[PDB]
């Protein structure tokens, strides 16, 4: 009875981590592109304006 | 008569130790798993949150 309670606690939190990794991988696809876009846009904003060289 | 009283005292406390070792072995089975579970869960709680890296 004790083992069964302990195992359930472990069985549940395993599912939570696997779901969490899935959540991270799903975002990581789009975040990488967001970071690339932002820098190029920032470089462009300087170009459009007079700021810097 | 003296020997018989002395021997009984020793005979009894032997049974108590053997029972005590049995009590320890029965718990040790489940305690080891409890200790493993707790650490992995703690590591996971940091992951779920923002705390640490």
> Residue A49 carries which DSSP code?
S
Structure tokens at B11: 């005979």
Q: State which approach was used to obtain the coordinates.
A: cryo-EM
Question: Considering Cα of B48, then B50, then B52, then B53, what sign does the dihedral take?
Answer: positive
Residue to mutate among A10, A15, A21, with most B CBs inside 10 A, is A10
Residue to mutate among A12, A17, A25, with most B CBs inside 10 A, is A17
Q: What's the reported resolution, in angstroms, to a tenth?
A: 3.9
B52/chain A closest Cα distance in angstroms: 17
For every residue of chain B, DSSP letters joined together read -HHHHHHHHHHHHHHHHHHHHHHHHHHHHHHHHHHHHHHHHHHHHHHHSSS--
Say if CB A20 and CB B47 are below 8 A apart. Answer: yes
> Residue A51 carries which DSSP code?
S
Question: Considering Cα of A30, then A31, then A37, then A38, what sign does the dihedral take?
Answer: positive
Structure tokens at A53: 């060289």
Residues 6+ apart with CB under 8 A from A15: none
Say if CB B44 and CB A17 are below 8 A apart. Answer: yes
């Amino acid at each position: 009875a004790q083992q069964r309670t302990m195992s359930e606690n472990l069985r549940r939190n395993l599912a939570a981590l696997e779901a969490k990794i899935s959540e991270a991988k799903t975002k990581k696809n789009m975040l990488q592109a967001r970071a690339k876009a932002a820098k190029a846009n920032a470089e462009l904003q300087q170009t459009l304006g007079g700021l810097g060289t």
